[PDB]
Every structure is written in C-alpha cells, then in structure tokens.
Symmetry: C3
Subunit: 579 residues, 3 copies
C-alpha cells in the first residue's frame, strides 16, 4: 500500500503492479484537504487533469486513477483550495467544472465543497448535486436552563461555511436545458464576484433544466436575482423544489420565475432587508412580454415575504399569468407571512383566475395592484389575518368579481371605506377587530346568480303538495287586431293583471284591468274588473273558452304588461299556455 | 495489508494477524469490478457464501470477512457480472438475491448495480433499495450559447446505464407482503427475459408490501404491467411514492393499481407509444371483481398520460371504486396532461364519488365511459383545458349529477350537442373558445336544491324589519256544513283568496272570492269581494271573530284553494293558524 | 501503516512521520466495535477527548486525529458499548453527546448508533441526525407461494435493533431552541431509564428547535409523551416532519403538540393499547393556558389513532386553538383511521374554525366534546365513514353552526336522535346505512342565508327581460298631517296596498286600501279601491303627480303597512322612490 503526502509526490512514484493502491495525505502537501485513493494504470496515456488522471512525470506512460467512493467527490480532490477568505480572489472555475463533469460521467452523485469562499462558476450536469459544508455549530447553555426557562437559552444558530461566488458577472450555478435531477445544498451564494468591484454577479441559481432541488441555501447580494428560473421551448423546466432556503437581498428581485411550471417553496424566505441596496420588486413571477414564457402551478407553503422601504423599490410579490395552458397561474400562498412592506400584486393583464391565499398573515395591504384595471377574476381568500401594522386598507387599486370569496379572515383595523372590492367580492363569515369596517356576508358568486335575479316563475305551495300558486309575466305589444295571448289551464283559478308600461309621451297606454277565471275539469266561468281603462289608450279583451285575446285601441298605446296568477291543486294545472 | 487480484486468490491466503486488512482488485480476476475489503478471522468456521464469508480452501478454520461501507453493497462484490450486453443471456438471480438478503441481514441499505444488462429477478427485503447506475452524461454547447439562444443548445439528455431484466416470465422485482420500506431507483427495467423470445416477463415491479419508493425508473416491454400493486388481506400495502418514473409500453397496461391505498405519482409518465405491440389500457385502477381488492387515496401530480391508437387497445385511464372504506376512491388528477388518445374512464359500478380533475390538459375527450349506465356521482372538474385536437366532445357515454361541478375550464371547440352531461352537471363560469357549445352557468347541486323548489311560505319584508308580507296556501275539501279553516293573527291586515281547483267534470267548484281582515291588538273588521261565486258550485264563508269557516253548496263542488296574504309589523303576527 | 487493537494501544505509540495512517481494530480491544482511522499530528497539543483527539501519553505533544468519512460517525468510535441488554444499566450519555457535539462541529451529518439497548440522553445539535440499526430481516416463504396464495405467506416483519433509553427521568432526545435540521431515524425509544424502576423517563423526543425530521421511529413506555413539541417565544418551532413513526403507550399522551406550527405526520400511528398503564389522552394538541403557547397548521395524513378503554383515560384526539395568528388551528385529518375508542375532541374555548376531516374512518363517535358549550364554528366533514362498531352516535355533547358542512359521508347505523348537531350543521348528500337516522340535505350556511330569509324585494320577470314585477314593503307611522311617502316611476303600472298593523288595543288602525297608478313617459292616471277604511281609524291619501302622500285620522291609529307592486317593461322604471 502506497502512502504519499500530496499529488506532486504521487507524480514521482510508479505503481508496482496493475491496480496498486495509493493514498494521498492531501492534494497540496500539508493542507489536510484533498486526500484520495488511486489505482495504478501502467499503460495510461490520457492527459493529466489533476483529478481523475494523475500522470507520473518521471515515466513515459502510467497514471494513478482516482477512485470515487459513495458517489461523493470532494472538490479539494481536484485541487480546489479550501478555507479561503473572500479576499483570496482566486478563479477556480475550471477545477469545479471538472468535478461536476467527472461525476456526471460516472453516474452522478455529489460534488462536496469545503468551507471557505470559492470563486468558481459551474454548469450543472444531470444527477449531480453541489453541496457545501456548514460552519461549526457549538450550542450555548445547560440542559437544565433550556428545559426550565421560557426565555431563549440556546442562542447559537447554524451558519454556512461554504460561500460560493462566480468568476464573472453572469451566474454562479447555471442549470442548462435538458439537465435533469441536478441540485445544490448546504451553502450560501454571494453576489460579489471576480472582475468587478462595483457590479455584482447577475444570478445565483439560473435554472433552464428540469427537476432541480435546493435545500439549506441562502443567496445574497446578486445584481439581478438570487434564483432565476427560465426554461426553453420544447424542453421541460419543471418539478423544482426548494426547502429551508433564504433568498435575500438582490438588486432586482430576490427571486424570479419566468418560464417554468410545478415549483414548490417550503419554509423558504424572500427578504429585501438592505434598503441602501436599491431594488425593484420582492418576488417576481413575470414571463417576459411577447415571448413563449409561461409560469403556472406554483405553491408557496410556510414562506416569509419581507421587505423594508427602499428608494424606487416596489415591495410586491407579483403574479403574472401569461399564455398558461388553463388560463390560471395556479399559484397558491399557503401558511405564508407577508412582513414589513410585503404585499401581493396582481399583474395579470387578462385577469387572475383562481387566486388562492389561505392562512396567511399580512402586515399591510394584502393586495396592491399597480396597473389600473387589472382584475382578480376568481379565487378564495380564506383564513388570513390582516394585521394592519402599516397601511390599514384591504387593497390598493384592486378589482375583483363575485367569484372572489373572502371568508374566515381576521381583519384587524382593516378599512374597506371607498374600496370597490367591498361591493364586488363574495363575503362569508369574517372576524372584524379594532376599527375594522364590518362587511355583512353577501353572496355574489356566479353559480348562485339564478337565486338573486328576479326569477322567471314565482309562487308558493302547500306542504302537502296539493295546493299551488304560480305567477308568470310577459310583455305584449298590442295593435288594433285581437290577438290570442294565452290559454288558462283546467282545474284552476286564475287572475290576469293587464297594465300599461309605455315609453310614449302623453299617448301611451293607460290601463289596470283584472280578469278572473275558474274552471273545473271542463267548464269555465270568467269575470272582469276594470280599475283603470282609458277609452282611448286602454285595452280590449275577449275570451273564447279558456283562451284570452287582447287588443289595443290606439296604436301609440301599445305596450302592456300581462301577469297571471294560477291557483291549482296539481303542478300539471299550474301554468298557462303562452301563445 | 494484503492485496490480491480476485476472490479465488483470497481463498489461498491466510491472514497473518487478527483482522488483517485484505483488498481484492476484482471479484473475478481481470474484470476490474467487484473488488472489496475484507478482515481476517482466524477462528471463523462459517460456510463460504462468495460474499460475506470467504473461506481459505483447505483449512478447518479461517475466513476473510467482507466489510460493507456506508450501507451500500455493490452487487459486483458478490461476483455479479457488469457491462453485459442484452444478448448475454446470463442468469444472475442467485447472486443478486444474496446481496439483497445479506443487506437485510445487517440493517438494510442499498444494493448498488453496475452498468449493463442484468438478467436477475429479486425478491425485495425490508429497508433495502436496489439502485442502478446512470450512463455517462456529457453536455453539449457553450455557456454563452446556452444563455443567449432561445433555441435548444444543450441537447444531451440523461440515459440509464443499468438495464434490469428477469430470468423468467414472472416479475423482475417482487415486493412481498410485510416487506416494508424497500425501493428501487436509477435504472431501466426491460420486459425481455431469459427462456423465451416471444413471451416477455409479466411485471417489472410487483408490489405486495408497504411503503415502497421508486425514483428515476423506467419500465418498458413487459407482458402485463411495468408496475403492479396488489396487497393481501390483513397486511398493509400503502404509502407508495413514485417520482420521475416513466412507465412505458406494456402488452396489458403501463401500470396497474389493484389493492392498495395512499399512492402518489409525481412527475411520472404513462405512455403506450408502440402501437405495433398491442395492449389493453393505458393506466388501470382495477380491483378484481368478487375479491376484497380495493384501491383508494391516489394522487397523480404533474403526470403525463399518452397513447397512440392501436388495434383493440382502449386508450383510457380507468378509475374503478370497489369496496373502498368511504365509498370514494379519492383519486385526484392534478396538473396532469392527457395526450394523443388518452382519456379518463369511469369504471365505478356504484358511481364515482368526489371525482377530482384540476388544472389538467386534454387533447381529446376528457371522459370516455365504456360501461353504459355508469355515473360520476359528484366531483369537481376545475381549471382544465379541452384542446379539442382530436375529438371535439366533452365526453362519451358519460353520466353525472348536479353535484359534479364544471368550473373555470377552457373549452376549445368543445361540443356538448346531444351530451346529456350538459343537462346534469352544475356549471360555474367557464371559457368557451372557437365553436364550443356555450353552456350558461346553472346550479344543480343537492345542497342548494331547496332554493329551486317552490317554497311553503313566500313574501317580502322591509330592510328595517318592521314590515312583513307573508303568504301561505292550502287545499280544502269542503262539504255542506261549515268548517273552521283558519284564524288570522292580531295586528295585521289579511287578504284571503278562495278559488276552486276541482277535478270533477262540469259540476266542479267555481268561485273566486276575496276576504279582507284588519285587526289591531284586539279589534277586528272584515270585508268581502265575491268576483265569481256560482250559486250551485260556489263557496260559503262565515267569520267568528278572527276564525274563518267555509262550506260548499253542492258536494260535487268540493275542492277549493285558500291563499292568505298577511301584512304585519312583527313576525309574531305574520302568519295565520291553520285549523 | 500502523494497525493496533484498540484506542488504548494507540495512546502508547508515536507516529513516525507527519500524517501517518493508523487503524484501530476496535475502540476497546477485543470487542469488534468502534475501529476507526487516525492521522498522526506530531505538533498537536489539544486535549485528549477519546474521540477526535487521541493524545500519546507521556509526551508533551502529539495526537492521533480521527478521520470521519461520509458525514457518518459511528458512536462506537467514541467508545459506545454495542449490543447491550436492557438489564445492562450502563450510562453512555457523555459518549453520545460527544458524538453529536463533534459532528455539529465539522458540518453536521449522522451519528450512527449500533444495535442494542443504549442508556444515553442527548441534546440535539444543528444538522445532526441520530440513526439506529434495524435488526436483521429474514423473509419467510417461497416466491411461488407468495405469488399464488392470497393468504399471507411472507410473515416476517421488520424489527428495530436499536433501543434508545434515557439515563434519568427527563427526556431521551432534547432539541433545544435554535437547533435546526436535526433528526432521528431507524430506532425505538423506550421509557425505562436508569435510576428508577417505577418512574419512567418523561419524554422520548422533546422538540424546542426548528425543522426536525423523524422516520421509522417508535416510542413506547414514557411517563409523559413519546413526542412533545413546545418552542419558545421569538424562535421558530416549525417545519417538522414525521413518517412511518409509531408513538405507542405513554402514561399521559402518546404525543403532544404544545407550541409549534407547520407539522406533518404521514403514515404514523398513535396507540394506547396497554390499558393497565393508565393514561390521560390519546393525542393532544394543547397549548398551556395563560401562556404564549400556540399550535396551528398541522396535517395528519393516513395516520391511525387507536385506543382501548382504560380507567380514567379519555380516548380523545384533542385540538385546542389558542391565540393562533388566523384564529384557526388549521388542523386537518386526511385519510385517517380512528380505531377502538378513539374519537376527536374539540377543545377550542373560542370555537373551532375550519375543522377538516376528510376520507377518515371512525369505529365509534366521530366527536366527543368534553367541555359543555364548546362549538365547532365552521368546517368540512367530508367522505368519512362512521362504522358504528362501538357507540352509534355521531357525536357527544358537540355543537356546530351551519358553516359546518356534512357531505359525502357513510353513516352506518349512525343515530342523530336528540343530537342538536342535526339541527345546526349543513348537510349535503350523505349515505345512510343500516338503522341510520336519515337526515335530508339542508343548507344552513351563512353565505347563502340571504336566500332563506324573506328578501327585501320580491317578484317575477319575463325570460325576455322586457317585463318585470317588483314588490317592496315599508312600515309607516302616520300623524294627522299629510306626508309624502313615495313616488311611482313612469312607464309602469303600480298597485299600492295600505293596511293597518297597529299594536294599540281597541283604537288601532283599521284599513285595507288599494291604490292604482298607470303612467306612460309623462302622463299619470290614478284610481282607488277602499275595501276597509274606518272613518275614525283609517288612512287618508292624496296624489300630487306621481308622489303619494298619506295621513292618519286619529293619532292612536298610526301604524300602517304600505306594499307597492310595480309592473314595468324596463329595470330603470321598476321601483318606486321611497321618500
Ligand atoms: Zn459505491
Ligand atoms: Zn472536502
Ligand atoms: Zn467569509
Ligand atoms: Zn468557522
Ligand atoms: Zn462580501
Ligand atoms: Zn413541462
Ligand atoms: Zn403545455
Ligand atoms: Zn382551485
Ligand atoms: Zn366556506
Ligand atoms: Zn353555494
Ligand atoms: Zn297583431
Ligand atoms: Zn264591466
Ligand atoms: Zn308605445
Ligand atoms: Zn473496464
Ligand atoms: Zn457506516
Ligand atoms: Zn441496450
Ligand atoms: Zn458497482
Ligand atoms: Zn454507455
Ligand atoms: Zn392500510
Ligand atoms: Zn414518503
Ligand atoms: Zn421530489
Ligand atoms: Zn377500516
Ligand atoms: Zn374532496
Ligand atoms: Zn367556485
Ligand atoms: Zn263535515
Ligand atoms: Zn270534486
Ligand atoms: Zn257582498
Ligand atoms: Zn466525504
Ligand atoms: Zn456502528
Ligand atoms: Zn431488547
Ligand atoms: Zn437480533
Ligand atoms: Zn414560525
Ligand atoms: Zn420537509
Ligand atoms: Zn405574525
Ligand atoms: Zn380551508
Ligand atoms: Zn359539495
Ligand atoms: Zn345493525
Ligand atoms: Zn308628520
Ligand atoms: Zn271611492
Ligand atoms: Zn298605535
């Protein structure tokens, strides 16, 4: 068994036999980082890559071949310098890319990064995850105090040990199209980068590929976004999952979804807490105009959106539906907290269909619609609390329809004064606290609109179903000829009311005439009561059996309303026949 | 430390001291795979198993004991042959089963398979995962082109390196009852098998046990199903999870659920795209008739169902409720895509309760009910798109009730002509495009049916709740003697309308009589208005205080309807007492 | 390369060169457990800790430094004693805490426990998981019998090999505040503890920190709870996940949530099946009264709650909302099974808002409210089955509102007799089986209450929308001076009914007066019909154009009801102006 102190020492030692074992103490002698296990290949003439092939310098052929165990490659085993400070401005892009590429060659797995600042941009490859190292965690306080005191005793919190920068202004971690199952975890990404002291790196994570996963990742200081997801036509950009991530200050948005679907954030935060670093929005779902960009099926569970006021900044969480397959962005805010200035912005030009906000908290306005005229077409705003710590309104410049349901919410000091949403939305039970404007429950949903219009038939019946009263009403344009208008049923008593409703000035119809009928199974008696019947502008009526005919007297007096009340013992005899 | 080239060489070497380390270069000399680490046990008398115990041949005592690291056993470390072609018809079942059995013996973990074609059927054991090896991934294109071009530049996609076949026609991976927490990942399973060139292996994964997990697995070419789940009575078959799996062509169904509950598919596909290989259905939830089989609580999230036409094949995704505890299969299609000929089939003999289809896309009919008479009893068909690329209809041979809600959907050219579903379902707002049959919103739900019937009491009230109009109506069978019929309340004005509604021919009742009452807190005045009152067939009335009595004149004229209109300032005085 | 038999021997040997490799056969000589790899540091002056630093005794400098691979430290490599019996009363707390503390120092990972009983309490540290070792699994039965027989053939089930006890009566696993990302898996926790044979350990897992995860963990025999979650003010106690866990018998509750949010249980069970070991509740969500404790956002998916009767035990699953941010505890029971005596208890003093029980099974009462007067304010009780195996009732001592929806359930022999819930809740379609009390569907929801009250306007219209009948009603207190009361619209016929509804004795108003109006676009005709109009106690009316004025005749006769019927052709002319 061969044991040397560095890769340079390995290059001076030849293997005795095929696949002899060699073990390096470190990559660079005396650092304690980068040690690995190698197998001797006497015939190898591949190019020395400082990673998988270690060519012996004192021989014409021969190499020590890296053995990766447990599908984890430590980047230090390719020569990456560990535990560097941010002031060590060393481009290690080529080394890190070698690690990702080589793991992707041998079936995927994990590229482990050490602690330290690393300036090295990487192109993700399928089924490879880049993983950092948490800094040391040392708890504070005794078990007794932790158990007995309600105050905080264990004050130590975890800290990232890996700080991943880019070598230029583009991105740190690019996930190309058709790259699937890649990931990143357990590190912090920083916007400061090689090549410029004033202009930071554009993106932390830029996702074009599919099924990306990130856990315990923070992003801070990026020139555009910490996270940016935009696929391409014809290739999947979907099934992305983020948990325990903190997308912090960025000069445009903390994060942006531009072209993707089926994305989930769980226990992640989005925070613009550096007001001196001016920015644009907080969290932005914004497909680019006049492109095939589309975003839909996004779920944010137990996330925090938090913003402090900043010069020129709009503290909004934007949802922009564009060219989605169903017409809904299917974006759900569940168990989320909007803190500081954070608020939801409807950016849907063709209306926001099925907007979902449930069990969320709002420090200020729940909705702030910048574009006048945008509408939330439908949705459910349930079990939320508007704390009213800042602004006291429900929304700014927002429009909804009756298919937007507001139910189960806690309104602390929430005012709906002069807010048209209060006359548009459906309200169920809600709780009004402090000085909140109490809105009585009111149904404005489309599914129930037939119960709110005047119906086309009206009446009442006996609980025994042997007595019925039904009333219908028709508009009649009468001329001077008698016209059959209706036939009353048998076994019924009917009252017909005829009155004018004419739009003519002076010469319109004037009449209020009651006609009465009672019939058994074959025989009919009628009677009349002319309360008002102008001899020039009134109405003429005539019975032929059970068929009523009407006529006007003067053509200008032509518009009459005819209402029928039918009393019967069975529904079959409850309605007239209109002719 | 000893280092030999194979296990056979290890059998010829004794350890110098207790627990001396030995390293095999390969399992079989010169193959380059399966090498492992062993520890010397001078006292060991166990049987050589070619895996964990390597006995020195020719001695009563002495063995080299395998050292498994990180709960991962490479199957090659039991002699399994790697890198084989599909034409290498080599049964390795015994070797693979030894690895699974041994890992289950020492606490579970992973059995790692190499790249290549492997003919070896395995019985899963608890807490053991079988994992293959991805083939090498090498991306295409420069970072600049990937970032700058909207066209696809990175064209390389991941490929499986492990192709797992069976050694006979049964199944590749059997998960017995009471085997819990097993899994499979990162491989492709193929239906071609040893012993027959014409009859393929029945199943890829056959699951009888509990809490199974599969990720990044494809199934293709199986004689029955790529995936088949059927538990047994008294043992759990539940909590199964599948992600990033592709269940491809099979001669019966791509996958089938027969007896199990709480199963989730996320970002999986079900595809019958080999029409020349005839098949039965696309995806089948089908408990066997006349058994205890039952399937319920199934969620398909962001899945693709895709089928091309094939002779005798039905391109359906079938849901069959049978013996479920709640009467609902609780099957949800969320964010799914039905492509080609794919369509949902209701196969519930006792009705499909709470059918859920949300944010799904349909290339053709959404529903195709093969069995005439089957009903979708209730559910929500929300936020879906019917593209109408193939057939333009909503459904075939399908029946629903008013508790099936159709809302928020996008209907491109969808025709409901002659489709009874349009007269059965509840419709909310929907979007109708092209030549789609515009269905007005209409509520047919059971919960609201009381708003669509005629009420037993009717009227109107003031917004101040100090003025009421209430009307009730009754049928009376009168004889020649007076009978008490009602008592009007105090503090009210009342109008009683009495009219005939008799089924007798010629000799029935004829009357239209209006009675009026006004009372303060104690005093009552009455008045009458006989509009129609036949001297033989009319009605007689008499007041005793506030109690009205009625009588007929001739027995054949006996059926009268009595309607009361009550005007009052308080609800307590708003209704008569019917006697 | 040095290889010695124990750590003790390592302390007696100095390394020859920098970073020489040393390998111990065991930690303690001859045990077969705890061997590890060390690197020589000649300069080291750190303190010997029996784990990471092994100082050579008798020298001022020099130490062997532990090499941890793969982020897994085996506790045996710190001297932990493996495979001990429960009767081996050996405290290993100091060793286990060292392992957790050291892994948290070098970036987190896993502390692997061996098989056996271990008495050792541990304080969790961030991003560190404690993992046990399953006992051996050996399946039973042939593949043929497993595949061909519908009866259970594979009878072997997984067994824990690690049994984790406490060293005293407090807790086994404490997760302090600000400790994040810790976990436990693959072991069993037992309440028996060192120092007392009669008083067991209080808690198995006590969680104060954030983002805890447990999988395949059982807890049994604890004096208080197997699982207990209570955070502190100002620090997150959230995002906790449990899967495949069994919280068994405990002397108070199997598990309790006291101060936490966003907790998920999937495929877990909660079972009090040892009635001889008396207990308090089954599963308890209970913030302490008069504290800042609060619990919300809890999901239980496919869990089992199972209780046998025990003297003094209440077999309840309690939900207590207290000071939650939205007023709803947001607790969901999905796909769950309540077995034996298990039943849900509403323990919300302020009402249980948005109670969710869906696709659950109940062996007995679904709800048992111990505190008389507690209400379920709203919720959805959908797709559940009440088997009626024990008690036949739906609930005990429970109160709901109409915003509690009961729909899609299967009521087997469920009796609602004398249960006020049947008169309070909203009922949709439900299935009534056996001797069950059939409850008709009835809507009692607040959102639709405007369809059940008398409306403030009533009438009927034509399907062509060119004929309308609208009626309104008002209360008038008239004096002796004429008072303008209304103005009838143009282009309409109106019938005004005026009648008394006076509460005065003897001297109240008496009138039934009908007034009629017809107008075209400018001209108006009126008529009157005084059916009742007392000369002393009646009403006076006067028209000025379309404005009606009313006056009384005697001050004591002052209360009049005025009903207006408007007939029109246009909505603009369908209503009077009330003055
Ligand atoms: Zn390996
Ligand atoms: Zn490293
Ligand atoms: Zn730093
Ligand atoms: Zn540090
Ligand atoms: Zn910096
Ligand atoms: Zn997609
Ligand atoms: Zn699409
Ligand atoms: Zn929805
Ligand atoms: Zn509701
Ligand atoms: Zn409704
Ligand atoms: Zn005409
Ligand atoms: Zn006349
Ligand atoms: Zn006219
Ligand atoms: Zn090879
Ligand atoms: Zn290990
Ligand atoms: Zn192949
Ligand atoms: Zn291998
Ligand atoms: Zn290949
Ligand atoms: Zn089950
Ligand atoms: Zn799971
Ligand atoms: Zn996933
Ligand atoms: Zn059951
Ligand atoms: Zn449902
Ligand atoms: Zn709706
Ligand atoms: Zn009689
Ligand atoms: Zn008769
Ligand atoms: Zn008279
Ligand atoms: Zn490592
Ligand atoms: Zn161990
Ligand atoms: Zn034991
Ligand atoms: Zn054992
Ligand atoms: Zn929190
Ligand atoms: Zn989680
Ligand atoms: Zn808050
Ligand atoms: Zn809800
Ligand atoms: Zn419903
Ligand atoms: Zn019975
Ligand atoms: Zn006055
Ligand atoms: Zn008069
Ligand atoms: Zn009075």
């Amino acid at each position: 068994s061969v044991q040397v102190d560095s890769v340079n020492a390995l290059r001076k030692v030849k293997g005795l036999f095929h696949n002899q074992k060699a073990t390096t103490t470190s990559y660079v002698a005396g650092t304690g980082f980068g040690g690995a296990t190698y197998l001797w290949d006497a015939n190898n003439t591949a190019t020395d890559d400082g990673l998988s092939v270690i060519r012996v310098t004192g021989a014409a052929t021969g190499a020590w071949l890296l053995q990766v165990h447990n599908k984890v490659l430590h980047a230090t085993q390719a020569g990456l310098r560990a535990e560097l400070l941010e002031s060590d401005l060393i481009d290690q892009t080529t080394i890190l890319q070698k690690c990702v590429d080589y793991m992707a060659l041998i079936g995927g797995g994990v590229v482990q990064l050490p602690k330290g600042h690393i300036y090295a941009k990487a192109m993700a490859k399928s089924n490879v995850e880049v993983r950092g190292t948490f800094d040391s965690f040392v708890s504070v306080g005794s078990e007794a105090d932790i158990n007995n005191l309600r105050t905080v005793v264990q004050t130590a919190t975890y800290k990232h040990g890996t700080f991943w920068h880019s070598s230029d202004g583009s991105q740190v971690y690019l996930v190309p199209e058709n790259v699937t199952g890649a990931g990143v975890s357990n590190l912090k990404m920083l916007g400061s980068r090689l090549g410029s002291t004033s202009s930071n790196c554009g993106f932390g994570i830029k996702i074009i590929g599919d099924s990306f996963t990130a856990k315990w990742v923070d992003t801070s200081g990026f020139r555009l976004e910490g996270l940016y997801i935009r696929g391409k036509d014809g290739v999947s950009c979907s099934n992305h999952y983020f948990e325990n991530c903190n997308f912090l200050d960025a000069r445009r948005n903390t994060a942006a979804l531009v072209y993707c679907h089926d994305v989930t954030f769980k226990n992640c935060t989005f925070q613009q807490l550096k007001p001196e670093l001016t920015w644009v929005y907080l969290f932005d779902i914004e497909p680019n105009p006049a492109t095939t960009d589309t975003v839909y099926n996004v779920t944010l569970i137990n996330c925090v959106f938090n913003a402090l006021a900043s010069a020129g900044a709009e503290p909004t969480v934007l949802v922009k539906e564009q060219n989605t397959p169903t017409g809904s962005p299917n974006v759900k805010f569940l168990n989320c907290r909007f803190k500081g200035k954070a608020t939801i912005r409807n950016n849907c030009a063709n209306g926001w269909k099925d907007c979902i906000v449930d069990n969320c908290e709002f420090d200020t306005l729940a909705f702030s619609t910048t574009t006048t005229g945008y509408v939330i077409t439908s949705g459910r705003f349930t079990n939320n609390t508007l704390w009213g710590k800042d602004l006291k309104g429900f929304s700014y410049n927002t429009l909804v329809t009756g298919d937007f349901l507001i139910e189960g919410n806690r309104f602390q000091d929430t005012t709906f004064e002069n807010n048209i949403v209060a006359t548009q939305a459906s309200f169920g039970v809600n709780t009004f606290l402090g000085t909140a404007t109490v809105i009585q429950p009111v149904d404005r949903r489309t599914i129930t609109q037939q119960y709110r219009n005047l119906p086309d038939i009206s009446g009442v019946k006996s609980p025994i179903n042997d007595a019925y009263f039904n009333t219908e009403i028709r508009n009649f344009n009468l001329d001077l000829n008698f016209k059959e208008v209706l036939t009353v049923p048998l076994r019924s008593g009917c009252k017909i009311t005829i009155t004018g409703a004419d739009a003519t000035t002076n010469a319109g119809s004037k009449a209020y005439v009651e006609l009465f009928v009672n019939s058994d199974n074959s025989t009919t008696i009628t009677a009349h009561n002319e309360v008002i019947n102008d001899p020039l502008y009134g109405v003429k009526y005539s019975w032929s059996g059970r068929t009523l005919s009407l006529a006007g007297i003067t053509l200008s007096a032509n518009t009459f309303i005819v209402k029928v009340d039918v009393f019967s013992a069975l529904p079959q005899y409850s309605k007239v026949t209109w002719l």
